[PDB]
Write a protein that binds this ligand. Structure first.
Ligand SMILES: *P(=O)(O)OC[C@H]1O[C@@H](n2cnc3c(N)ncnc32)[C@H](O)[C@@H]1O
Length: 340
């Protein structure tokens, strides 16, 4: 899992490759991403500011004239959402602009996060109805949130983890949910807040339904069960479920401030099942021994979801020690689902 989303960072041009039939543009590789650029705007090795997909860029026709026709209103401001595109057949994701367009970054170094100085914020799809409830309090500071870094941003890490084994799970398109025990308190959280129980709150309903609160009372340990709530009325319901349900993907050990490993998590899920508490888990694929490029990893992401008749969002890879994870989102999914 991870820190702040570095939406805009100083990165380096990698290989530049022609786009057949399109002499005014070319393909720039930037880490594990491919970005269409104007012909000659970069050469291999040049630095630039790379803005990832899901960046929302406030309207400014001087700095960002290439975005001018894509301006929308979003959370009260005018600007452009960057999203996946496919131009002269070339997949294109993000925006890469030369350093000389940013005189205020004259003193910066390759790798720097420039999101805040450039005023970039994150676009997200709208939240689903009964997933915001009354707030009890902050997302607990003693539990990690569930964000995962992208494979495209991890090129040296993927190389450094050659030979290491990963649990591979299907990435479900829902909302992150955490149900935890800390001493005398059991709480249910969404992605960012701890929620109050009401008749209408979806997370609480899913936690009562699968007896996972009872399961935590049984284990008698300070643990956060983290998973995806999916189903009807949640993010278009890709799985075509009836009703909603929680699918575990991680367990956080609150007292040790660490995740359980995949084998430790499997064992505890088995113990819960063995004692009548059936908490469902995200689909687990074959463990992978890593010996792969980012491209090769991305090529794995499309495939069957929980519902084997639909094409999945992607995959999450969790190293067997529980200390290194990342996501590989299916670019076919991003192409199909323009609201993603
Ligand atoms: P996505 O781009 O929303 O990034 C991380 C979130 O994915 C959710 N999630 C769904 N399925 C999984 C699996 N299999 N492993 C871990 N995380 C999963 C979480 O809500 C993350 O916050």
């Amino acid at each position: 899992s991870m820190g702040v989303r570095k939406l805009a960072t100083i990165r380096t041009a990698g290989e530049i490759t022609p786009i057949a039939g399109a002499e005014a543009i070319e393909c720039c590789h930037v880490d594990g991403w491919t970005c269409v650029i104007k012909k000659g705007e970069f050469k291999q090795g040049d630095r630039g500011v790379y803005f990832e997909i899901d960046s929302f860029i406030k309207e400014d026709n001087d700095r960002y004239p290439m975005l001018s026709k894509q301006v929308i209103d979003y959370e009260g401001q005018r600007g452009t959402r960057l999203r996946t595109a496919r131009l002269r057949g070339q997949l294109s994701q993000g925006l890469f602009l030369p350093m000389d367009r940013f005189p205020e970054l004259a003193s910066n170094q390759v790798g720097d996060d420039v999101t805040e100085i450039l005023g970039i914020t994150k676009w997200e799809p709208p939240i689903s109805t009964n997933l915001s409830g009354e707030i009890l309090g902050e997302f607990p500071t003693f539990i990690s949130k569930t964000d995962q870094e992208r494979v495209q941003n991890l090129i040296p890490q993927i190389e450094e983890n050659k030979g290491q084994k990963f649990e591979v799970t299907v990435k479900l398109d829902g909302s992150s949910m955490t149900v935890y025990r800390k001493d005398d308190h059991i709480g249910v959280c969404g992605r960012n807040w701890e929620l109050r129980e009401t008749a209408t709150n979806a997370q609480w309903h899913a936690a009562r339904r699968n007896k996972m609160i009872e399961g935590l009372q049984f284990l008698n340990r300070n643990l956060a069960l983290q998973g995806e709530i999916i189903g009807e009325s949640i993010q278009g319901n890709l799985e075509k479920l009836k009703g909603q349900d929680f699918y575990l993907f991680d367990i956080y050990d609150i007292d040790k401030a660490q995740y359980l490993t995949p084998i430790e998590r499997q064992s505890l899920v088995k113990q819960l099942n063995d004692n009548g508490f059936t908490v469902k888990h995200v689909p687990i694929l074959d463990d992978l021994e890593l010996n792969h490029t980012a491209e090769q990893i991305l090529a794995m992401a499309d495939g069957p979801s929980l519902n084997k008749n639909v094409k999945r969002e992607g995959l999450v890879f969790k190293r067997l020690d529980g200390k290194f994870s990342f996501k590989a989102i299916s670019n076919a999914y991003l192409e199909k689902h323009k609201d993603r």
